Coordinates of all heavy atoms in Angstrom, one line a residue:
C1128 N 0.8 -1.2 0.0 CA 0.0 0.0 0.0 C 0.8 1.3 0.0 O 0.3 2.4 0.0 CB -0.9 0.0 1.2 SG -2.3 -1.2 1.2
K1129 N 2.2 1.1 0.0 CA 3.0 2.3 0.0 C 3.4 2.7 -1.4 O 4.1 3.8 -1.6 CB 4.2 2.1 0.8 CG 5.1 0.9 0.3 CD 6.2 0.6 1.2 CE 7.0 -0.6 0.7 NZ 6.2 -1.8 0.7
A1130 N 3.1 1.9 -2.4 CA 3.5 2.2 -3.8 C 2.3 2.5 -4.7 O 1.1 2.2 -4.3 CB 4.2 1.0 -4.4
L1131 N 2.5 3.1 -5.8 CA 1.5 3.5 -6.8 C 2.1 3.6 -8.1 O 3.2 4.1 -8.3 CB 0.8 4.7 -6.3 CG -0.6 5.1 -7.0 CD1 -1.4 5.8 -6.0 CD2 -0.4 6.1 -8.2
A1132 N 1.3 3.3 -9.2 CA 1.8 3.3 -10.5 C 0.9 4.2 -11.4 O -0.3 4.3 -11.2 CB 1.8 1.9 -11.1
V1133 N 1.5 4.9 -12.3 CA 0.9 5.9 -13.2 C 1.1 5.5 -14.6 O 2.3 5.3 -15.0 CB 1.4 7.3 -12.9 CG1 0.8 8.3 -14.0 CG2 1.0 7.8 -11.5
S1134 N 0.1 5.3 -15.4 CA 0.2 4.9 -16.8 C -0.1 6.0 -17.8 O 0.7 6.3 -18.6 CB -0.6 3.6 -17.0 OG -0.2 2.5 -16.3
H1135 N -1.3 6.5 -17.7 CA -1.7 7.5 -18.6 C -1.8 8.9 -18.0 O -1.9 9.9 -18.8 CB -3.1 7.2 -19.2 CG -4.2 7.2 -18.2 ND1 -4.5 6.1 -17.4 CD2 -5.1 8.1 -17.9 CE1 -5.5 6.4 -16.6 NE2 -5.9 7.6 -16.9
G1136 N -1.7 9.0 -16.7 CA -1.4 10.3 -16.1 C -2.5 11.3 -16.1 O -2.2 12.5 -16.0
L1137 N -3.8 11.0 -16.2 CA -4.9 11.9 -16.1 C -5.9 11.4 -15.1 O -6.9 10.8 -15.4 CB -5.6 12.1 -17.5 CG -4.7 12.8 -18.5 CD1 -5.4 12.8 -19.8 CD2 -4.3 14.2 -18.0
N1138 N -5.6 11.8 -13.8 CA -6.5 11.6 -12.7 C -6.8 10.1 -12.5 O -7.9 9.6 -12.7 CB -7.8 12.4 -12.8 CG -8.6 12.4 -11.5 OD1 -8.2 11.9 -10.5 ND2 -9.8 13.1 -11.6
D1139 N -5.7 9.3 -12.2 CA -5.8 7.9 -12.2 C -5.4 7.3 -10.8 O -4.5 7.8 -10.2 CB -5.0 7.3 -13.3 CG -3.6 7.8 -13.3 OD1 -3.2 8.7 -12.5 OD2 -2.8 7.2 -14.1
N1140 N -6.2 6.3 -10.4 CA -5.6 5.3 -9.5 C -4.6 4.4 -10.3 O -4.7 4.3 -11.5 CB -6.8 4.4 -8.9 CG -6.3 3.6 -7.7 OD1 -5.1 3.6 -7.4 ND2 -7.2 2.8 -7.2
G1141 N -3.8 3.7 -9.5 CA -3.0 2.6 -10.1 C -3.9 1.5 -10.6 O -3.5 0.8 -11.5
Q1142 N -5.0 1.3 -9.9 CA -6.0 0.3 -10.3 C -6.6 0.7 -11.7 O -6.5 1.9 -12.1 CB -7.1 0.2 -9.3 CG -6.7 -0.4 -8.0 CD -7.8 -0.3 -7.0 OE1 -8.9 0.2 -7.3 NE2 -7.6 -0.9 -5.8
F1143 N -7.2 -0.3 -12.4 CA -7.9 0.0 -13.6 C -9.2 0.8 -13.4 O -9.4 1.8 -14.1 CB -8.1 -1.3 -14.4 CG -6.9 -2.0 -14.7 CD1 -6.6 -3.2 -14.1 CD2 -6.0 -1.5 -15.6 CE1 -5.5 -3.9 -14.4 CE2 -4.8 -2.2 -15.9 CZ -4.6 -3.4 -15.3
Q1144 N -10.0 0.3 -12.5 CA -11.2 1.1 -12.1 C -11.1 1.3 -10.6 O -10.5 0.5 -9.8 CB -12.5 0.3 -12.4 CG -12.7 -1.0 -11.7 CD -14.0 -1.6 -12.2 OE1 -14.8 -1.0 -12.9 NE2 -14.2 -2.8 -11.7
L1145 N -11.6 2.5 -10.2 CA -11.5 2.9 -8.8 C -12.7 2.4 -8.0 O -13.9 2.8 -8.4 CB -11.4 4.4 -8.7 CG -11.4 5.0 -7.3 CD1 -10.2 4.4 -6.6 CD2 -11.4 6.5 -7.3
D1146 N -12.5 1.6 -7.0 CA -13.6 0.9 -6.3 C -13.5 1.5 -4.9 O -12.7 1.0 -4.0 CB -13.4 -0.6 -6.3 CG -14.7 -1.3 -5.8 OD1 -15.6 -0.7 -5.4 OD2 -14.6 -2.6 -5.8
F1147 N -14.4 2.4 -4.5 CA -14.5 2.8 -3.2 C -15.2 1.7 -2.3 O -14.9 1.6 -1.1 CB -15.4 4.1 -3.1 CG -14.7 5.3 -3.6 CD1 -15.1 5.8 -4.8 CD2 -13.8 6.0 -2.8 CE1 -14.5 7.0 -5.3 CE2 -13.1 7.1 -3.3 CZ -13.5 7.6 -4.5
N1148 N -16.0 0.9 -2.9 CA -16.7 -0.1 -2.2 C -15.9 -1.4 -2.1 O -16.4 -2.4 -1.6 CB -18.0 -0.4 -2.9 CG -19.0 0.7 -2.9 OD1 -19.1 1.4 -1.9 ND2 -19.6 1.0 -4.0
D1149 N -14.7 -1.4 -2.6 CA -13.8 -2.5 -2.4 C -13.4 -2.6 -0.9 O -13.1 -1.6 -0.3 CB -12.5 -2.4 -3.2 CG -11.6 -3.6 -3.3 OD1 -12.0 -4.7 -2.6 OD2 -10.6 -3.6 -3.9
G1150 N -13.4 -3.8 -0.4 CA -13.0 -4.0 1.0 C -11.5 -4.0 1.1 O -11.0 -3.8 2.2
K1151 N -10.8 -4.1 0.0 CA -9.3 -3.8 0.0 C -9.0 -2.4 0.3 O -9.8 -1.5 -0.1 CB -8.7 -4.2 -1.3 CG -8.8 -5.7 -1.5 CD -8.1 -6.0 -2.8 CE -8.1 -7.5 -3.1 NZ -7.5 -7.9 -4.4
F1152 N -8.0 -2.1 1.1 CA -7.5 -0.7 1.3 C -6.9 -0.3 0.0 O -6.1 -1.0 -0.7 CB -6.6 -0.6 2.5 CG -7.3 -0.7 3.8 CD1 -7.3 -1.8 4.5 CD2 -7.9 0.4 4.3 CE1 -7.9 -1.9 5.8 CE2 -8.5 0.4 5.5 CZ -8.5 -0.7 6.2
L1153 N -7.1 1.0 -0.3 CA -6.3 1.6 -1.4 C -4.9 1.9 -0.9 O -4.6 1.9 0.3 CB -7.0 2.9 -1.8 CG -8.4 2.6 -2.4 CD1 -9.1 3.9 -2.7 CD2 -8.2 1.8 -3.7
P1154 N -4.0 2.1 -1.9 CA -2.7 2.6 -1.5 C -2.8 4.0 -0.9 O -3.6 4.8 -1.3 CB -1.9 2.6 -2.8 CG -2.6 1.6 -3.6 CD -4.0 1.6 -3.3
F1155 N -1.9 4.3 0.0 CA -1.7 5.5 0.8 C -2.9 5.7 1.8 O -3.0 6.8 2.4 CB -1.5 6.7 0.0 CG -0.3 6.7 -0.8 CD1 -0.3 6.3 -2.1 CD2 0.9 7.0 -0.2 CE1 0.9 6.2 -2.9 CE2 2.1 6.9 -1.0 CZ 2.1 6.5 -2.3
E1156 N -3.8 4.8 1.9 CA -5.0 5.0 2.7 C -4.7 4.9 4.2 O -4.3 3.8 4.7 CB -6.1 4.0 2.3 CG -7.4 4.2 3.0 CD -8.5 3.2 2.5 OE1 -8.1 2.5 1.5 OE2 -9.6 3.2 3.0
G1157 N -4.8 6.0 4.9 CA -4.5 6.0 6.3 C -3.3 6.7 6.8 O -2.9 6.6 7.9
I1158 N -2.7 7.5 5.9 CA -1.4 8.2 6.2 C -1.6 9.5 6.8 O -2.5 10.3 6.3 CB -0.5 8.2 4.9 CG1 -0.1 6.8 4.6 CG2 0.7 9.1 5.1 CD1 0.7 6.7 3.3
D1159 N -0.9 9.9 7.9 CA -0.9 11.2 8.5 C -0.5 12.3 7.5 O 0.4 12.1 6.7 CB 0.1 11.2 9.7 CG -0.1 12.4 10.6 OD1 -1.0 13.3 10.3 OD2 0.7 12.6 11.5
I1160 N -1.2 13.4 7.7 CA -0.9 14.6 7.0 C 0.4 15.2 7.5 O 1.3 15.6 6.7 CB -2.0 15.7 7.1 CG1 -3.3 15.1 6.6 CG2 -1.7 17.0 6.4 CD1 -3.2 14.8 5.1
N1161 N 0.7 15.0 8.8 CA 2.0 15.5 9.3 C 3.1 14.5 8.9 O 2.8 13.5 8.3 CB 1.8 15.6 10.9 CG 2.8 16.5 11.5 OD1 3.6 17.2 10.7 ND2 2.8 16.6 12.8

């Protein structure tokens, strides 16, 4: 979850489709602003 990949570079998740309802955590999910 610390890594992420960019392919076409226009507002993209590393995933092919963005699933908010996925039970999997997204990358960077839960990181402090500080």
Side-chain angles (χ1 to χ4, degrees):
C1128 290
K1129 61 185 180 295
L1131 194 146
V1133 172
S1134 295
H1135 64 278
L1137 291 176
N1138 193 2
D1139 53 351
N1140 192 359
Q1142 294 174 356
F1143 300 111
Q1144 63 181 356
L1145 179 61
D1146 191 0
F1147 291 105
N1148 297 318
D1149 191 0
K1151 294 181 181 180
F1152 285 102
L1153 294 176
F1155 298 97
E1156 183 175 358
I1158 291 177
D1159 191 3
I1160 301 299
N1161 202 3

